[PDB]
Ligand binder design. Structure first.
Ligand SMILES: *[C@@H]1O[C@H](CO)[C@@H](O[C@@H]2O[C@H](CO)[C@@H](O[C@@H]3O[C@H](CO)[C@@H](O)[C@H](O[C@@H]4O[C@H](CO)[C@@H](O)[C@H](O)[C@@H]4O)[C@@H]3O)[C@H](O)[C@H]2NC(C)=O)[C@H](O)[C@H]1NC(C)=O
Ligand SMILES: *[C@@H]1O[C@H](CO)[C@@H](O[C@@H]2O[C@H](CO)[C@@H](O[C@@H]3O[C@H](CO)[C@@H](O)[C@H](O[C@@H]4O[C@H](CO)[C@@H](O)[C@H](O)[C@@H]4O)[C@@H]3O)[C@H](O)[C@H]2NC(C)=O)[C@H](O)[C@H]1NC(C)=O
Ligand SMILES: *[C@@H]1O[C@H](CO)[C@@H](O[C@@H]2O[C@H](CO)[C@@H](O)[C@H](O)[C@H]2NC(C)=O)[C@H](O)[C@H]1NC(C)=O
Ligand SMILES: *[C@@H]1O[C@H](CO)[C@@H](O[C@@H]2O[C@H](CO)[C@@H](O)[C@H](O)[C@H]2NC(C)=O)[C@H](O)[C@H]1NC(C)=O
Ligand SMILES: *[C@@H]1O[C@H](CO)[C@@H](O[C@@H]2O[C@H](CO)[C@@H](O)[C@H](O)[C@H]2NC(C)=O)[C@H](O)[C@H]1NC(C)=O
Ligand SMILES: *[C@@H]1O[C@H](CO)[C@@H](O[C@@H]2O[C@H](CO)[C@@H](O)[C@H](O)[C@H]2NC(C)=O)[C@H](O)[C@H]1NC(C)=O
Ligand SMILES: *[C@@H]1O[C@H](CO)[C@@H](O[C@@H]2O[C@H](CO)[C@@H](O)[C@H](O)[C@H]2NC(C)=O)[C@H](O)[C@H]1NC(C)=O
Ligand SMILES: *[C@@H]1O[C@H](CO)[C@@H](O[C@@H]2O[C@H](CO)[C@@H](O)[C@H](O)[C@H]2NC(C)=O)[C@H](O)[C@H]1NC(C)=O
Ligand SMILES: *[C@@H]1O[C@H](CO)[C@@H](O)[C@H](O)[C@H]1NC(C)=O
Ligand SMILES: *[C@@H]1O[C@H](CO)[C@@H](O)[C@H](O)[C@H]1NC(C)=O
Ligand SMILES: *[C@@H]1O[C@H](CO)[C@@H](O)[C@H](O)[C@H]1NC(C)=O
Ligand SMILES: *[C@@H]1O[C@H](CO)[C@@H](O)[C@H](O)[C@H]1NC(C)=O
Ligand SMILES: *[C@@H]1O[C@H](CO)[C@@H](O)[C@H](O)[C@H]1NC(C)=O
Ligand SMILES: *[C@@H]1O[C@H](CO)[C@@H](O)[C@H](O)[C@H]1NC(C)=O
Ligand SMILES: N[C@@H](Cn1oc(=O)[nH]c1=O)C(=O)O
Ligand SMILES: N[C@@H](Cn1oc(=O)[nH]c1=O)C(=O)O
Ligand SMILES: [Ca+2]
Ligand SMILES: [Ca+2]
Ligand SMILES: [Cl-]
Ligand SMILES: [Cl-]
Ligand SMILES: [Zn+2]
Ligand SMILES: [Zn+2]
Ligand SMILES: [Zn+2]
Ligand SMILES: [Zn+2]
Lengths: 689, 689
C-alpha cells in the first residue's frame, strides 16, 4: 500500500547523513554565490526526486556584512589614546578548515568610546534592577551583556532605550560551557575564542526592512535607510569569553546585586560604571564598519500537486542560509527536508499523490530576520490565507540528544500525540517503547500527568509570518538537550560543523531519523487525512488556562480593578461559548454523513479557518504584523510565545504608569478585543446556516 | 418548475404598493421606539413568509438628536444683539400629517456669530477658487454652501480645513426645483420651507464613531467622545431656500467669480465676506444644541439555508431607518426587499431551496453613517470574508422614472447585461422591448456602442463595508431621473411620503416591480447558478481603462516624471498579466470536467475570492477601513467611486506640494502597491498547483 507506513519506511538515516555532509563543506551565507549555487543544486535534486514543479523565487532585500578591508574589533584604550588590548579579528578555524568573521548583523557604523556597564543578560528585569534598584544610569555608557535567556535583538533594544551608546555581547561559560565536556574539536563545548554571530534587528514581523507589507520584487519601492524597519541606532559586536574576561576583569563601581548576575569567569562581575581606581582612566572603544546592502536572495519552492484538493496547501519549510558551515543550524533540518522530499517523490513515482497539495520550501536569509519566508508569504498572502492548511517548520533537527521538543498550535496537539505513539523511540533505555512514551517521561507536561510538554509559538524562526501574520496552523519539532532560549554551546559559531554532529550529537543519525519521521509524518497526515487532523477542543482547553492566567496577573492589582471596574467576565464568557460550540462541532464532525464531500469540505474549511479566525486585521498595538490575538512573540523575548499578548502587554509594569486611568482603560480595551475575537472564532464553528 | 421565471412571476406590484403604504405612515428614525416596533414587525413577517431563521442583531452606537426643548435655528443679529431674522424651527407638514425637525446629525453644540462667506457647493475646487484665485479667507467666517454635487460631510470637512467657524447648508432651487413642475403637495418639487436632513460625519468606513474595528456590543469598550471618529469641530445646520434667500440677499464683498457659482434665487450670489455697506454691522448667529447619545439600534437578519452550499452567502440588504416617513428613502427599497423575501419564501414552501444560502437584512441607522450594516459586518467579518459570495444593496428603488441606474463590480457586468435582456421594459414607448434595450438607449455607455452605463462603487450606502472593507463583490440597481450626486428634490425632507410616490413617481408600481426583478433576479442567479455568474475578463477590461486614465493624469507633469523616474510600466505589466491569466481561467471554466464538484468548487472559490484579492490588509493611506486597491470612495466626494484611489490621491494637487521629491516618491510607492495587488489578484486565477 501507499500509506503513512510506506512513507515513513522509505526514510533512511544514511541518506540524511550523506545530505548533511553535502550541505556543510563550505559556508552558505545569505546573499553569497555559494548559497545561490546550493539553491540551484536543491532545485535540481527536488526535480530529480519527483516534484511536479520546482522554482526559485528571488527577492532583493537589505543584508549586512563586515567590511573585508576594515575589520570590526573592540579595544581597551589608555588615556593617551593607545589601544592596549584588542579583541580577536576572527575565530580560530577548526582542524582541517569566505568564513565571515563574528559580527552583529545590521549594527550601524561607529567608534564610540566610554565606560562599561555590565547588564547581565540585558533583559527588561535586568535593566529594571540597574536603573530602579541600583540607581545605575546607562546613558552614554557602553553596555556589556552575556548572551542567553532572550533573543539578542531584545537585549539591544533594551540597551538603546536605557541610553547606551554601544553594546558588546559575549558568551559566558556559565551559559555556553557544560561541566565535564571538552571544548571543540574534542567535545561539544564552546572554546574561549568561539563567538556567536547573529542578527540584532527588532523587525516585529516586518520582513525586509525596506519593504514592509509588500514583496521585495524587481519594481518594489524601498524605504530610504533612515526610515528602515528595526535598525539599531547604536553599534553592537559579539566576542568570546577569553576576550570578555579581559573587558570584565578590571570592572569597578557597584558589586553584582546577587549571584544570578555572576557568570563562571574568574571576575567579580561588578556592574560598573567603568574600571577600578588604578585603571579608572582607561576606556573601551568599539570599531564597527559593517555595511548594509540590498542583495538578492533565493528561495526554492517545490510543489507536489494534490490528487483531490490541489487548492489546499500543506507546507514544509526551513532555511538553507547559514552563518558559516551550518552543521546543525540549518543543515541538520535541511537534510531532513531533503530526505522527506525524496521519500514523497518515491511514492509519487509509483503512482501515489497526496490528497492535498504539499509545498516544500528552502528559505533564504532566515539568519538576517526571516527575510526569505516573509517576502514569499507577502508575495503569496492571498493564496496562503484562502488555501493554507498548515505550516511545519524544519530548521535544526537536533540541538541535543535527550528528548523531543515540540512547539505548535493547540489544533495540532492530538495529531502530535497520536503520531508519536506510533513511532519508535530512538532513546537509550526505551528500546521497543514509543516516542510518546520516552518524550512524556523526559519532558512531562506541567498541567497533565501522562502528557508531554508542548510549548507556545512566538518567533525566532520561519514559521513566524505564517502563524503570527497570516493565522495558518503551524508546528515545529526537534530533538533537544536536558538554557531553553540560550542555544547549544556552538550555536552560530565557526565550530558548528558536520564533524560536531557526526562525532558528538548523532553518530548513527537516529535522532535525525526520528525528527524526519515526526515532521514528515505530520505533513503526511495533514496532506492525506480525509478530515483535517485538527481538534478544536484542544483550543478550548488552553483558552481557559490562558484566561485564568491573564486574570491572575490582573488580580495582583485588586484596588485598581475596583477603581476602574476591570472585569474579565466577557473573556470567560467567550471561552465558555467556544468550549460549548467546539464540543458540538466535534460531535457533528464525528456524526456527519461521511458520504457527503460538501459537508466534509465545509467542515474541513471550518477546521482550516479556525486558526485564521484568531487574526485581527488591525494587528496588535504598535506591532501591525503580529495579528494573532491568542499568541504573539513576547515583547521582551522574540523567542518566547506569550498568550493573550495584547492584555499581557497592557498589564506589564502597569504600577509604573503615570496615568493609571489611561493604562487600565487600555487593559479593558484589550479584554474587549480578546473576548470579541474568542467569540468570533467560536462562531466560525457554529452551523453555517 | 422552480427556476428564475417562477421566482420573478411571483413578484407583484400590488404587494410592493401595500408594503410601502404600511412602512410609511409614521416616522421610523433610528434609535426610536417606532423603528424598533417596525423591526419586530419585519422579523415576524419574514418568519411567516418562510425563512428558516430571523433574528434581531442589536448594537449600542453613537446617535445624534436635536434638543426637543432647546431648538436649533440661525439668526441675522443687529449691532445691539437683537435677532432681526430667524430661520424656521420646523418644515410646514404636508396635508393630513415625532417628526424630527431639520438638523445636521453629529453637529457639535455652539452659538458662533460672524460674517458670511458663500462657497458655492463647498467642493475642494470651490475652496481652491476662493482661497487661491479670489484670495478670500474663510478663517473665522461662517460659510454658507448649497447642497448638491458631493456628499454633505465632504463640504463640512472642506469648510473646517478652510478655518470656518460654522457651516449653513441650504437647498438652492437651481439644484432642487425642476422647471415646470409644482412644489409638493401638487408636484414633486421642493417648496421653499422644505429642508434636507442628513449626517455630516466623515467616518471613512469606520462605522459607530466610538468602536472602530469591533462591534458595538454589550461589553464593548468605547472611545471617549474627544477621540471619536469623524466628528465635526464646527456647528452645522440645514435650511430651505426661503430662509437662504434672507441670508444671501444682503451679501457684499466680491462678486461671484462666474456663472457656475450663481443659483436660481433672486440674489447676486456675492461671495462676501459679510453684508453690503448698509448692513455691514449685522452678523449671522447659529444656535445649535443637538446632543450625541449612545442608543440601541436593531438589524433584522433572515436566513434561507442553501441546499448544496449552505456555507456560501449571497446577501440582499437595505436599510429600514428613515429621517421622517421615508416614502422613497428607504421604504421604496425595503418594500421591494419584503416582496422578494415573500416570493423566495413561496418557492421554499413548495419544497425549493436555493443552491447557496441567502441572507436578507433590514439595516438600522444607515442615515447616521451606515452604522447597522457596519457593526454587523464587524461582528461577522470572519464569516463574511471566508463565505461571502456577493452583496446586493436595496435602498430606494426609485429616485426618478426615466431609466435604470446600476453601480457594481466589473465581476457582475455580464450578469446584469444578461438579466436585463430577459426582463421587460416598463418604459413608455418600449413596450414589448427588453429592459436592456430601454436602459442602453437612455443611458449609453461612454465607452461602448450598444452597451449601457454602469458606474463605480464608492460609498454613500450600506454596501460600503462589504465592498470597500471586506472585498465582497457588490452591486446596486434603481430607477433614476434624466444632478447625479445631488438627490431628487424632496430628498430627506418631511415631504417624502407615500403620496409623493403613489401620485408623482410610480402610480402603477411598475418601476418598483422592475427594480424588484433586477435585484431579486441578481440574488437568484448568484444563489442558484452552478458556476458563480462572475466574469473575470470584465475586470481585465476595466483595469486597462483605469491604468490608462491614471497614467494620463500623471502625464500632465512630464518634467516631474522625468526628474523622479516615475514609471507606470509595472502597472501595465500587471494589467497585461491579469488579462492573459483571466482569459485562460475562463477557458478552463468553460472546459472543466463538469462532473467534478471539487474542480467546480475550486473554481467557484477562485471566482468568489477574486474580489477579495484586491483588498490590501494595510488599507489606503490614512483610511484603514478602505482597503480595496482598485476602488475607493473619492476623498472629495464619498458618493463617487474613484479608481486606483491610492495613486489618484498621491497625484491630486501635486503641483502644490512643498516637497516634490517626497510627493512623487509617494506616487511611485502607490504605483508599486497597485501593480503588486493587480498581479497578486491575477495569480489567484492561475492553476492552483
Ligand atoms: C456567550 O453566548 C451567549 C449566548 O448563549 C451570549 O449571550 C448573550 O449575551 C448578551 C449580552 O449579555 C445578551 O444581551 C442582552 O440582550 C437582550 C435582548 O436579547 C437585551 O434586552 C439586554 O439588554 C440590556 O440588559 C443589559 C444588561 O443589564 C443593559 O445593559 C441594557 O441597557 C439593556 O437593558 C442585553 O443586551 C444576549 O441576549 C445573549 N444572547 C442569547 C442568550 O442568545 C454571550 O454574549 C456570549 N459571550 C460573548 C462574549 O459573546
Ligand atoms: C507579468 O508576468 C511576467 C511573467 O510572464 C513577469 O515576468 C517576470 O519579470 C521579472 C521582473 O522583470 C523577471 O525578473 C528577472 O528575473 C531574472 C531571473 O529569472 C533575473 O535574472 C533578472 O534579474 C536582473 O535583471 C534586472 C533587470 O535589468 C536587474 O535589475 C537585476 O539587477 C538583475 O540583473 C530579473 O529579476 C522575471 O524573470 C519574469 N518571470 C518570468 C518570465 O517567468 C512579470 O514580472 C509580471 N508583472 C508583474 C507586475 O508582476
Ligand atoms: C553535493 O551533491 C551534489 C549532487 O549530487 C554534487 O553536485 C554534483 O556534482 C557532480 C560532479 O561534480 C556534477 O557533475 C553535477 O552537476 C552536480 N549535481 C547537481 C549540482 O545537482 C555536489 O558535488 C556535492 N557537493 C559536495 C560538497 O560533495
Ligand atoms: C590594536 O590594534 C590597533 C589598530 O591596528 C593597533 O594600533 C595601531 O598600531 C599601528 C602600529 O603600531 C599604528 O601605526 C597605528 O596608528 C595604530 N592604530 C590605532 C591606534 O588605531 C594597536 O597596536 C593594537 N593593540 C594591541 C595591544 O595589539
Ligand atoms: C487521535 O486518535 C484518537 C484515538 O484513535 C482519535 O480519536 C478517535 O477518533 C475516532 C474517529 O472519530 C472516534 O470514533 C473515537 O471515539 C475517538 N477516540 C477518542 C476520542 O478517544 C483522534 O481522532 C485522533 N486525532 C486526530 C486524528 O487528530
Ligand atoms: C403594517 O402591517 C402589519 C402586519 O400586517 C400590521 O400589524 C398587524 O396589525 C394587527 C392589527 O392591529 C395586529 O393584530 C398584528 O399583531 C400586527 N402584525 C404584525 C405586527 O406582524 C400593521 O398594523 C400595519 N401598519 C399600518 C400602518 O398599517
Ligand atoms: C428670534 O428668536 C429669538 C429667540 O427666541 C427672539 O428673541 C427673544 O425674544 C424674547 C421676547 O421678545 C426675549 O425676551 C428674549 O430674550 C429673546 N432672546 C434672544 C434675543 O435670544 C427674537 O425676537 C426672534 N426674532 C424674530 C425676528 O422673530
Ligand atoms: C451571459 O450570457 C452569455 C450568452 O449566453 C453567456 O456566454 C455563453 O456561455 C456559454 C456557457 O459557458 C458558452 O458556451 C458560450 O460560448 C457563451 N457565449 C458568449 C460568451 O458569447 C455568459 O456566460 C453569460 N454570463 C453569465 C452567466 O455571467
Ligand atoms: C571598506 O573599507 C574602507 C574603509 O572606509 C574603504 O576603502 C571602503 O569604502 C569600505 N567598503 C565599504 C564601505 O563597503
Ligand atoms: C542618566 O544620565 C544622563 C546624564 O547625561 C541624563 O541625561 C539622564 O537623564 C540620566 N537619568 C537618570 C534618571 O539619572
Ligand atoms: C549525546 O548523548 C550522550 C548520552 O548522555 C551524551 O553523553 C552526549 O553528551 C550527548 N551529546 C550532546 C551534544 O548532548
Ligand atoms: C435640552 O434643553 C435644555 C438646555 O440646556 C436643558 O434643560 C437640557 O439639559 C437639554 N437636554 C439635553 C442636553 O439633552
Ligand atoms: C486667514 O485669516 C486668519 C486671520 O486671523 C489668519 O490666521 C490666516 O493665516 C489667514 N490665511 C491667509 C493665507 O490669509
Ligand atoms: C414620471 O414620468 C413622467 C414622464 O415623463 C414625468 O412627467 C414625471 O415627471 C415623472 N416623475 C418624476 C418624479 O420624475
Ligand atoms: N533564527 C534566527 C534569525 N532570527 O530569528 C528571528 O525571529 N529573527 C531573526 O533574525 C536567530 O535567532 O538569530
Ligand atoms: N446614505 C446616507 C447616509 N450616509 O451615506 C454614507 O455613506 N454615510 C452616511 O452617513 C446619506 O447619504 O445621507
Ligand atoms: Ca517586504
Ligand atoms: Ca464598531
Ligand atoms: Cl524548527
Ligand atoms: Cl441601493
Ligand atoms: Zn536556523
Ligand atoms: Zn541560525
Ligand atoms: Zn437611504
Ligand atoms: Zn437617506
Amino acid at each position: 500500500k501507499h500509506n503513512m507506513k510506506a512513507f515513513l519506511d522509505e526514510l533512511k538515516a544514511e541518506n540524511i547523513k550523506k545530505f548533511l555532509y553535502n550541505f556543510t563543506q563550505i559556508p552558505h551565507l545569505a546573499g553569497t554565490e555559494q548559497n545561490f549555487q546550493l539553491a540551484k543544486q536543491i532545485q535540481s535534486q527536488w526535480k530529480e526526486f519527483g516534484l511536479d514543479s520546482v522554482e526559485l523565487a528571488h527577492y532583493d532585500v537589505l543584508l549586512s556584512y563586515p567590511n573585508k578591508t576594515h575589520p570590526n574589533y573592540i579595544s581597551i584604550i589608555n588615556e593617551d589614546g593607545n589601544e592596549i588590548f584588542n579583541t580577536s579579528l576572527f575565530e580560530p578555524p577548526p582542524p582541517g578548515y569566505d568564513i565571515v568573521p563574528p559580527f552583529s548583523a545590521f549594527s550601524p557604523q561607529g567608534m564610540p568610546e566610554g565606560d562599561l556597564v555590565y547588564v547581565n543578560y540585558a533583559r527588561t528585569e535586568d535593566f529594571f534592577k540597574l536603573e530602579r534598584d541600583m540607581k545605575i544610569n546607562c546613558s552614554g555608557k557602553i553596555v556589556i551583556a552575556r548572551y542567553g535567556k532572550v533573543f539578542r535583538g531584545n537585549k539591544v533594544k533594551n540597551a538603546q532605550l536605557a541610553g547606551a551608546k554601544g553594546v558588546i555581547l559575549y558568551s559566558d561559560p556559565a551559559d555556553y560551557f557544560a561541566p565535564g565536556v571538552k571544548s571543540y574539536p574534542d567535545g561539544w563545548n564552546l572554546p574561549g575564542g568561539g563567538v556567536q554571530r547573529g542578527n540584532i534587528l527588532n523587525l516585529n514581523g516586518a520582513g525586509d526592512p525596506l519593504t514592509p507589507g509588500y514583496p521585495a520584487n524587481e519594481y518594489a519601492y524601498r524605504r530610504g535607510i533612515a526610515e528602515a524597519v528595526g535598525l539599531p541606532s547604536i553599534p553592537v559586536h559579539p566576542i568570546g569569553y577569553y576576550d570578555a574576561q579581559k573587558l570584565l576583569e578590571k570592572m569597578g563601581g557597584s558589586a553584582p546585586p546577587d549571584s544570578s548576575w555572576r557568570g563562571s569567569l574568574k571576575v567579580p562581575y561588578n556592574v560598573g560604571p567603568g574600571f577600578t581606581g588604578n585603571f579608572s582612566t582607561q576606556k573601551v572603544k568599539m570599531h564597527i564598519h559593517s555595511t548594509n546592502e540590498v542583495t538578492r536572495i533565493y528561495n526554492v519552492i517545490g510543489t507536489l500537486r494534490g490528487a483531490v484538493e490541489p487548492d489546499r496547501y500543506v507546507i514544509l519549510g526551513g532555511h538553507r542560509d547559514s552563518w558559516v558551515f551550518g552543521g546543525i543550524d540549518p543543515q541538520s533540518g535541511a537534510a531532513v527536508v531533503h530526505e522527506i522530499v525524496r521519500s514523497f517523490g518515491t511514492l509519487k513515482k509509483e503512482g501515489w499523490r497526496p490528497r492535498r497539495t504539499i509545498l516544500f520550501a528552502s528559505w533564504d536569509a532566515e539568519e538576517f530576520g526571516l527575510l526569505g519566508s516573509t517576502e514569499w508569504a507577502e508575495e503569496n498572502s492571498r493564496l496562503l490565507q484562502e488555501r493554507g492548511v498548515a505550516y511545519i517548520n524544519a530548521d535544526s533537527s537536533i540541538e541535543g540528544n535527550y528528548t523531543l521538543r515540540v512547539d505548535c498550535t493547540p489544533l495540532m496537539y492530538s495529531l502530535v500525540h497520536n503520531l508519536t505513539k506510533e513511532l519508535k523511540s530512538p532513546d537509550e533505555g526505551f528500546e521497543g517503547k514509543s516516542l510518546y512514551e520516552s518524550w512524556t517521561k523526559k519532558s512531562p507536561s506541567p498541567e497533565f500527568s501522562g502528557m508531554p510538554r508542548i510549548s507556545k509559538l512566538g518567533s525566532g524562526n520561519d514559521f513566524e509570518v505564517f502563524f503570527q501574520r497570516l493565522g495558518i496552523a503551524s508546528g515545529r519539532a526537534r530533538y533537544t538537550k536536558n538554557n531553553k532560549f540560550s542555544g547549544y554551546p556552538l550555536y552560530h559559531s565557526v565550530y558548528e560543523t558536520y564533524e560536531l554532529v557526526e562525532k558528538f550529537y548523532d553518530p548513527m543519525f537516529k535522532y535525525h531519523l526520528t525528527v524526519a519521521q515526526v515532521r514528515g509524518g505530520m505533513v503526511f497526515e495533514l496532506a492525506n487525512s480525509i478530515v483535517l487532523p485538527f481538534d478544536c477542543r484542544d483550543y478550548a482547553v488552553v483558552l481557559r488556562k490562558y484566561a485564568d492566567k491573564i486574570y491572575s496577573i490582573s488580580m495582583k492589582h485588586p484596588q485598581e480593578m475596583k477603581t476602574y471596574s476591570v472585569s474579565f467576565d466577557s473573556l470567560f464568557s467567550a471561552v465558555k461559548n467556544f468550549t460549548e460550540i467546539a464540543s458540538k462541532f466535534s460531535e457533528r464532525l464525528q456524526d456527519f454523513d461521511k458520504s457527503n464531500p460538501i459537508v466534509l469540505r465545509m467542515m474541513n474549511d471550518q477546521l482550516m479557518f479556525l486558526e485564521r479566525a484568531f487574526i485581527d486585521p488591525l494587528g496588535l498595538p504598535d506591532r501591525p504584523f503580529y495579528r494573532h490575538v491568542i499568541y504573539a512573540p513576547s515583547s521582551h523575548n522574540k523567542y518566547a510565545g506569550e498568550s493573550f499578548p495584547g492584555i499581557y502587554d497592557a498589564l506589564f509594569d502597569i504600577e509604573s504608569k503615570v496615568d493609571p486611568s489611561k493604562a487600565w482603560g487600555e487593559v479593558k480595551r484589550q479584554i474587549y478585543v480578546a473576548a470579541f475575537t474568542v467569540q468570533a472564532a467560536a462562531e466560525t464553528l457554529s452551523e453555517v446556516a
